[PDB]
Design an enzyme around this catalytic site. Structure first.
Site, PDB file in Angstrom:
ATOM      1  CG  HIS B  41     -15.409   8.065  11.082  1.00 10.89           C
ATOM      2  ND1 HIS B  41     -15.435   8.256   9.717  1.00 10.89           N
ATOM      3  CD2 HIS B  41     -14.122   7.977  11.488  1.00 10.89           C
ATOM      4  CE1 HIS B  41     -14.169   8.289   9.332  1.00 10.89           C
ATOM      5  NE2 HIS B  41     -13.341   8.132  10.363  1.00 10.89           N
ATOM      6  N   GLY B 143      -5.910   6.821  10.276  1.00 11.91           N
ATOM      7  CA  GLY B 143      -5.472   8.120  10.779  1.00 11.91           C
ATOM      8  C   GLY B 143      -5.555   9.231   9.733  1.00 11.91           C
ATOM      9  CB  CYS B 145     -10.520   9.888   8.700  1.00  9.34           C
ATOM     10  SG  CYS B 145     -10.643   8.132   8.306  1.00  9.34           S
TER      11      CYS B 145
END
Ligand SMILES: COc1cccc(Oc2cc(Cl)cc(NC(=O)Cc3cncc4ccccc34)c2)n1
Ligand SMILES: COc1cccc(Oc2cc(Cl)cc(NC(=O)Cc3cncc4ccccc34)c2)n1
Lengths: 304, 304
Positions: B41, B143, B145
């Site tokens: 993503h 942030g 991830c």
């Protein structure tokens, strides 16, 4: 979202851990620059520990008796000296992995990460608070001595604790990196009272603000209180008195949530008087005091 | 003595964290050998996330669009590919800090350490369990991830989790290092049910054994039970059924304490039916399920 008992990343400290052996005793040391710091009780045998004369015991030791090993390589000891309850072993090689560091004496109620070690090897990392009575409720076994507590600010490691012993009560005692014990403790196997502990009120309020930020709000009420009224309740429940300096430290969390500190105190007053009624807060069924206001902001803002 | 929610020392994982930027999105990547792994993503914009066609979105990207930075140095991307929900960015340089590692898919009820990161920089480390419903109750902000979960066995890091998202319920979902989600989750901003969670019975029993080892014994009773009788209670209280394989895994702790597993089940049965009555176990007022039998033995034996 979510709120965890988060420790600092331990990498910078792992690179400083070494094994120190003197005679038949092995514990951990902290290698910073060309000095290895370790608990002075490394020079004791089991008979010595009941009433050790450290000056006399150290006089029987020479540089070559202190075996220092960093991983698989042996360090050459060129000096030794005792500062309070720590030994400082000068080695001929500066630790190439020495991070930027400071030696700090933390205040009771402040938190830090502990890197539990055995034989100079790191086993785990956990976050804890220095209790108001200067003990820590850690997780340490025999061989863990010399494991350190620390905080990290960007690239600087502030070492605040070195592990020395476990009291018969199962709680832990140790020193700052200058070898000064936190609390009334001595490095001797003799009866030692820790004294009355209290709950860290400012940390509980900080954790209640963390709960609100993360969505647990059931405990918020329609009440307020005063510092004096709150302190009568804190007295009854063995909580530290809340001061204006604590209210000021809670300023940022009060602004973030829009909940005045005295209104949060009223919520805490009601939880102290009525309990949780079988409900939980941030996954806990008791009032948590191991997060400082600084920890809450840091975790809720993702500082690296 | 003492028992803490202990994480693995994070050093070996800190040396693998990098920052990955694609367009306007920045998240964390894991640099192992000459490959950087990150959530796919990273290629989405906020409009894309509602219903992304990852194959189409990735086709608009070239090697030079993936900005990978390890500390202050930029890595040169020479290949990119999507495997399930992760992107694998081939770089021209092998990570010199690559530890010995494995990619593993953990089972629900197992635990691991998470190194929370932002902008490729480590912020903290905490221990958690993969819930029976395949979510994790972590502590993650936007942030985070690409932050990973792992376990360490001597010098080998077994990566088991990569963080991808936070469900509207505040719990977290992610993938193994081959990009396969744990649970029924998809990397899309659409309604996603986590499903009924349960308490990890074998972990609660392991933690009760940890309590006995560390001196908290008030909950031990004069009773015993059978697997069937215990499972009727576990059903009523949303606990996972206890199997003979769980009893076998609890073998070592049963031998260490001399308390038969079914006798410990009877203690757990009484705590489930009567509550704690305002008492605590290992500093907790609820039944803890984030320690596996393996974690209890490891912490109570000081494995490094
Ligand atoms: C009898 O009262 C006391 C009070 C305080 C101390 C005391 O003995 C002493 C005195 C000195 Cl100088 C060092 C030690 N060392 C240790 O306690 C080492 C250790 C550390 N951590 C966890 C441990 C778990 C299990 C076993 C040992 C552990 C003890 N006795
Ligand atoms: C509406 O239901 C859902 C269900 C599952 C996901 C969903 O949106 C998505 C879908 C995708 Cl592909 C990625 C993301 N990313 C994230 O959630 C990033 C993130 C991670 N961790 C903690 C965070 C805290 C605050 C903000 C963002 C966080 C979200 N929406």
């Amino acid at each position: 979202s979510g709120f965890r008992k988060m420790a600092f990343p331990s990498g910078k400290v792992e690179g400083c851990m070494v094994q120190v052996t003197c005679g038949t005793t092995t514990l951990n040391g902290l290698w910073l620059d060309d000095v290895v710091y370790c608990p002075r009780h490394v020079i004791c045998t089991s008979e010595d520990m009941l009433n050790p004369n450290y000056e006399d015991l150290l006089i029987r030791k020479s540089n070559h008796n202190f075996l220092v090993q960093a991983g698989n390589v042996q360090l050459r000891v060129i000096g030794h000296s005792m500062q309070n309850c720590v030994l400082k072993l000068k080695v001929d090689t500066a630790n190439p992995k020495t991070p930027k560091y400071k030696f700090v004496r933390i205040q009771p109620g402040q938190t830090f990460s502990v890197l539990a070690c055995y034989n100079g090897s790191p086993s785990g990392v956990y976050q804890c608070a220095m209790r108001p009575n200067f003990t820590i409720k850690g997780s340490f076994l025999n061989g863990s001595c010399g494991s350190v507590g620390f905080n990290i600010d960007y690239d600087c490691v502030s070492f605040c604790y070195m592990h020395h012993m476990e009291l018969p009560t199962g709680v832990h005692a140790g020193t700052d990196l200058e070898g000064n014990f936190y609390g009334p403790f001595v490095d001797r196997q003799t009866a030692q009272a820790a004294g009355t502990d209290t709950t860290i009120t400012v940390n509980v309020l900080a954790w209640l603000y963390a709960a609100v930020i993360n969505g647990d709000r059931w405990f918020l009420n329609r009440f307020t209180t005063t510092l004096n009224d709150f302190n009568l309740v804190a007295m009854k429940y063995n909580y530290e008195p809340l001061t204006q300096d604590h209210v000021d430290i809670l300023g940022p969390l009060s602004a973030q949530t829009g909940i005045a500190v005295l209104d949060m105190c009223a919520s805490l007053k009601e939880l102290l008087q009525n309990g949780m009624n079988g409900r939980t807060i941030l996954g806990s069924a008791l009032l948590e005091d191991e997060f400082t206001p600084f920890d809450v902001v840091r975790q809720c803002s993702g500082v690296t």
